[PDB]
PDB file of C-alpha atoms and ligand atoms in Angstrom:
ATOM      1  CA  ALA A   1      35.534  40.215 -56.433  1.00  0.00           C
ATOM      2  CA  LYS A   2      36.833  40.838 -52.835  1.00  0.00           C
ATOM      3  CA  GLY A   3      40.867  40.549 -53.497  1.00  0.00           C
ATOM      4  CA  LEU A   4      41.361  37.541 -51.287  1.00  0.00           C
ATOM      5  CA  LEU A   5      44.423  36.558 -53.283  1.00  0.00           C
ATOM      6  CA  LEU A   6      46.605  39.779 -52.821  1.00  0.00           C
ATOM      7  CA  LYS A   7      45.785  39.413 -49.467  1.00  0.00           C
ATOM      8  CA  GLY A   8      48.909  36.643 -49.868  1.00  0.00           C
TER       9      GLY A   8
ATOM     10  CA  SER B   1      35.620  53.231 -45.664  1.00  0.00           C
ATOM     11  CA  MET B   2      35.226  51.926 -42.202  1.00  0.00           C
ATOM     12  CA  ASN B   3      33.428  48.232 -41.569  1.00  0.00           C
ATOM     13  CA  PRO B   4      30.405  48.588 -39.780  1.00  0.00           C
ATOM     14  CA  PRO B   5      30.567  46.425 -35.901  1.00  0.00           C
ATOM     15  CA  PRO B   6      30.039  43.051 -36.651  1.00  0.00           C
ATOM     16  CA  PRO B   7      26.936  41.191 -35.817  1.00  0.00           C
ATOM     17  CA  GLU B   8      25.763  40.722 -32.563  1.00  0.00           C
ATOM     18  CA  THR B   9      26.248  37.316 -30.927  1.00  0.00           C
ATOM     19  CA  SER B  10      24.933  37.727 -27.523  1.00  0.00           C
ATOM     20  CA  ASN B  11      21.481  39.656 -27.130  1.00  0.00           C
ATOM     21  CA  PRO B  12      20.779  40.303 -22.724  1.00  0.00           C
ATOM     22  CA  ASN B  13      16.692  40.644 -24.625  1.00  0.00           C
ATOM     23  CA  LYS B  14      16.818  37.509 -26.659  1.00  0.00           C
ATOM     24  CA  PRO B  15      15.888  34.522 -25.420  1.00  0.00           C
ATOM     25  CA  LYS B  16      18.050  31.565 -26.090  1.00  0.00           C
ATOM     26  CA  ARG B  17      17.765  27.841 -26.052  1.00  0.00           C
ATOM     27  CA  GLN B  18      19.329  24.239 -26.647  1.00  0.00           C
ATOM     28  CA  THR B  19      17.583  22.010 -29.265  1.00  0.00           C
ATOM     29  CA  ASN B  20      19.396  18.883 -30.420  1.00  0.00           C
ATOM     30  CA  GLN B  21      18.725  20.465 -33.606  1.00  0.00           C
ATOM     31  CA  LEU B  22      20.576  23.727 -32.689  1.00  0.00           C
ATOM     32  CA  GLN B  23      23.159  20.419 -31.087  1.00  0.00           C
ATOM     33  CA  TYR B  24      23.568  19.220 -34.405  1.00  0.00           C
ATOM     34  CA  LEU B  25      23.592  22.011 -36.469  1.00  0.00           C
ATOM     35  CA  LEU B  26      27.794  23.130 -34.540  1.00  0.00           C
ATOM     36  CA  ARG B  27      28.660  19.273 -34.573  1.00  0.00           C
ATOM     37  CA  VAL B  28      28.414  20.041 -38.668  1.00  0.00           C
ATOM     38  CA  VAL B  29      29.656  23.342 -38.535  1.00  0.00           C
ATOM     39  CA  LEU B  30      33.095  22.456 -36.425  1.00  0.00           C
ATOM     40  CA  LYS B  31      33.597  18.747 -37.981  1.00  0.00           C
ATOM     41  CA  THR B  32      32.960  19.922 -41.467  1.00  0.00           C
ATOM     42  CA  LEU B  33      31.911  23.127 -42.898  1.00  0.00           C
ATOM     43  CA  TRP B  34      34.418  25.026 -40.297  1.00  0.00           C
ATOM     44  CA  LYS B  35      37.828  22.687 -41.301  1.00  0.00           C
ATOM     45  CA  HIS B  36      36.702  22.732 -44.788  1.00  0.00           C
ATOM     46  CA  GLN B  37      39.242  23.838 -47.502  1.00  0.00           C
ATOM     47  CA  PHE B  38      36.728  26.813 -49.179  1.00  0.00           C
ATOM     48  CA  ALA B  39      35.745  27.897 -45.385  1.00  0.00           C
ATOM     49  CA  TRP B  40      38.555  30.497 -44.628  1.00  0.00           C
ATOM     50  CA  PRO B  41      36.999  33.354 -46.272  1.00  0.00           C
ATOM     51  CA  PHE B  42      33.514  32.798 -44.540  1.00  0.00           C
ATOM     52  CA  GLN B  43      35.060  32.175 -40.541  1.00  0.00           C
ATOM     53  CA  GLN B  44      34.883  35.774 -39.856  1.00  0.00           C
ATOM     54  CA  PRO B  45      33.118  39.022 -40.796  1.00  0.00           C
ATOM     55  CA  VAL B  46      34.359  40.689 -44.547  1.00  0.00           C
ATOM     56  CA  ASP B  47      36.738  43.174 -43.740  1.00  0.00           C
ATOM     57  CA  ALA B  48      36.088  45.965 -46.244  1.00  0.00           C
ATOM     58  CA  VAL B  49      39.173  48.299 -44.783  1.00  0.00           C
ATOM     59  CA  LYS B  50      41.365  45.324 -45.100  1.00  0.00           C
ATOM     60  CA  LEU B  51      40.554  44.274 -48.814  1.00  0.00           C
ATOM     61  CA  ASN B  52      39.738  48.262 -49.185  1.00  0.00           C
ATOM     62  CA  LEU B  53      36.133  47.665 -49.864  1.00  0.00           C
ATOM     63  CA  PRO B  54      34.269  50.978 -50.134  1.00  0.00           C
ATOM     64  CA  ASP B  55      31.945  49.165 -51.672  1.00  0.00           C
ATOM     65  CA  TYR B  56      30.856  46.356 -49.663  1.00  0.00           C
ATOM     66  CA  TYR B  57      28.354  48.344 -47.029  1.00  0.00           C
ATOM     67  CA  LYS B  58      26.879  49.799 -49.953  1.00  0.00           C
ATOM     68  CA  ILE B  59      25.960  46.230 -51.312  1.00  0.00           C
ATOM     69  CA  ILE B  60      25.569  43.939 -47.640  1.00  0.00           C
ATOM     70  CA  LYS B  61      23.070  45.243 -45.953  1.00  0.00           C
ATOM     71  CA  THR B  62      22.582  42.217 -43.956  1.00  0.00           C
ATOM     72  CA  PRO B  63      25.999  40.730 -43.090  1.00  0.00           C
ATOM     73  CA  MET B  64      26.620  37.522 -41.951  1.00  0.00           C
ATOM     74  CA  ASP B  65      29.589  35.441 -41.410  1.00  0.00           C
ATOM     75  CA  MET B  66      30.127  30.896 -40.014  1.00  0.00           C
ATOM     76  CA  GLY B  67      32.662  32.880 -37.209  1.00  0.00           C
ATOM     77  CA  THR B  68      29.524  34.900 -36.349  1.00  0.00           C
ATOM     78  CA  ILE B  69      27.335  31.892 -36.669  1.00  0.00           C
ATOM     79  CA  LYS B  70      29.506  29.545 -34.714  1.00  0.00           C
ATOM     80  CA  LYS B  71      29.961  31.424 -31.510  1.00  0.00           C
ATOM     81  CA  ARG B  72      26.182  32.281 -32.308  1.00  0.00           C
ATOM     82  CA  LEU B  73      25.909  27.637 -31.565  1.00  0.00           C
ATOM     83  CA  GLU B  74      28.436  28.306 -28.669  1.00  0.00           C
ATOM     84  CA  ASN B  75      26.605  31.135 -26.375  1.00  0.00           C
ATOM     85  CA  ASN B  76      23.205  29.390 -27.485  1.00  0.00           C
ATOM     86  CA  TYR B  77      21.993  32.616 -28.875  1.00  0.00           C
ATOM     87  CA  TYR B  78      19.181  30.651 -31.450  1.00  0.00           C
ATOM     88  CA  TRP B  79      15.771  29.774 -30.230  1.00  0.00           C
ATOM     89  CA  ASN B  80      15.482  27.062 -32.994  1.00  0.00           C
ATOM     90  CA  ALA B  81      17.510  25.878 -35.707  1.00  0.00           C
ATOM     91  CA  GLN B  82      15.312  27.926 -37.990  1.00  0.00           C
ATOM     92  CA  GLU B  83      16.650  31.075 -37.106  1.00  0.00           C
ATOM     93  CA  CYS B  84      20.605  29.284 -37.528  1.00  0.00           C
ATOM     94  CA  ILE B  85      19.271  27.660 -41.808  1.00  0.00           C
ATOM     95  CA  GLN B  86      18.686  31.309 -42.622  1.00  0.00           C
ATOM     96  CA  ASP B  87      22.508  33.143 -40.935  1.00  0.00           C
ATOM     97  CA  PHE B  88      23.603  30.393 -43.581  1.00  0.00           C
ATOM     98  CA  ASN B  89      21.340  30.877 -46.329  1.00  0.00           C
ATOM     99  CA  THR B  90      22.056  34.897 -45.870  1.00  0.00           C
ATOM    100  CA  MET B  91      25.811  33.820 -45.689  1.00  0.00           C
ATOM    101  CA  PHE B  92      24.911  33.062 -49.418  1.00  0.00           C
ATOM    102  CA  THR B  93      23.923  34.820 -50.351  1.00  0.00           C
ATOM    103  CA  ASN B  94      25.100  37.446 -50.357  1.00  0.00           C
ATOM    104  CA  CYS B  95      29.217  36.106 -51.611  1.00  0.00           C
ATOM    105  CA  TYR B  96      26.797  35.627 -54.590  1.00  0.00           C
ATOM    106  CA  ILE B  97      24.987  39.625 -54.263  1.00  0.00           C
ATOM    107  CA  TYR B  98      28.702  40.899 -53.665  1.00  0.00           C
ATOM    108  CA  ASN B  99      30.135  38.875 -56.418  1.00  0.00           C
ATOM    109  CA  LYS B 100      29.955  37.866 -60.357  1.00  0.00           C
ATOM    110  CA  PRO B 101      29.860  34.502 -61.978  1.00  0.00           C
ATOM    111  CA  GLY B 102      33.026  32.786 -62.677  1.00  0.00           C
ATOM    112  CA  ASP B 103      34.462  34.093 -59.400  1.00  0.00           C
ATOM    113  CA  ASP B 104      36.374  32.367 -57.724  1.00  0.00           C
ATOM    114  CA  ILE B 105      35.167  32.823 -54.370  1.00  0.00           C
ATOM    115  CA  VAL B 106      31.509  32.205 -55.119  1.00  0.00           C
ATOM    116  CA  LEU B 107      33.043  28.494 -56.531  1.00  0.00           C
ATOM    117  CA  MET B 108      33.744  28.242 -52.828  1.00  0.00           C
ATOM    118  CA  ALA B 109      30.354  29.325 -51.734  1.00  0.00           C
ATOM    119  CA  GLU B 110      28.680  27.802 -53.650  1.00  0.00           C
ATOM    120  CA  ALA B 111      30.933  24.558 -52.623  1.00  0.00           C
ATOM    121  CA  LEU B 112      30.837  24.865 -49.044  1.00  0.00           C
ATOM    122  CA  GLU B 113      26.894  25.603 -49.770  1.00  0.00           C
ATOM    123  CA  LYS B 114      26.314  22.544 -51.719  1.00  0.00           C
ATOM    124  CA  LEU B 115      28.094  20.124 -49.032  1.00  0.00           C
ATOM    125  CA  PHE B 116      26.164  22.555 -46.079  1.00  0.00           C
ATOM    126  CA  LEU B 117      22.346  21.748 -47.834  1.00  0.00           C
ATOM    127  CA  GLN B 118      23.464  17.525 -48.024  1.00  0.00           C
ATOM    128  CA  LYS B 119      24.008  18.251 -43.654  1.00  0.00           C
ATOM    129  CA  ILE B 120      20.419  20.429 -43.470  1.00  0.00           C
ATOM    130  CA  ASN B 121      18.451  17.059 -45.478  1.00  0.00           C
ATOM    131  CA  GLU B 122      19.642  14.913 -42.620  1.00  0.00           C
ATOM    132  CA  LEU B 123      18.852  16.526 -39.511  1.00  0.00           C
ATOM    133  CA  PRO B 124      17.520  15.263 -36.889  1.00  0.00           C
ATOM    134  CA  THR B 125      13.977  14.740 -35.446  1.00  0.00           C
TER     135      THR B 125
HETATM  136 CL1  LIG C 201      38.101  37.459 -54.219  1.00  0.00          CL
HETATM  137 CL1  LIG C 202      36.403  50.684 -39.948  1.00  0.00          CL
HETATM  138 CL1  LIG C 203      15.453  24.043 -33.555  1.00  0.00          CL
HETATM  139 NA1  LIG C 204      45.903  32.448 -50.956  1.00  0.00          NA
HETATM  140 NA1  LIG C 205      17.043  25.236 -22.457  1.00  0.00          NA
HETATM  141 NA1  LIG C 206      15.340  19.076 -27.627  1.00  0.00          NA
HETATM  142 NA1  LIG C 207      34.005  47.562 -53.152  1.00  0.00          NA
HETATM  143 NA1  LIG C 208      12.012  31.685 -37.138  1.00  0.00          NA
END
């Protein structure tokens, strides 16, 4: 995982 | 910490050409894959700086993304469709290698890859 959910 | 230079999308020493199969791949990217609901994480290189992923480019030494592929097709960078298909396989494999099973990003890649392979199985000529 890359923390993409944290982007927004 | 830093991002690498992104993959090249033009090269004055690499021969270029247009083929009907390469045109078909561009049509698939523009009409189907680019606007897919799961496309957005693949539309540009992984920004390890913004995402604070110091390990990404230690693990992924052949990065690839659909933004790069799209620009390569639009610039006629490829000689044949196989080069382009290999770039797609690299993009999907990188995602599976860096991430882990059960990650939502892996599910997104798998769904995009399933659709891409359906379109490959319909390639012309
Ligand atoms: Cl993620
Ligand atoms: Cl950087
Ligand atoms: Cl070709
Ligand atoms: Na989001
Ligand atoms: Na040509
Ligand atoms: Na052709
Ligand atoms: Na990392
Ligand atoms: Na080839």
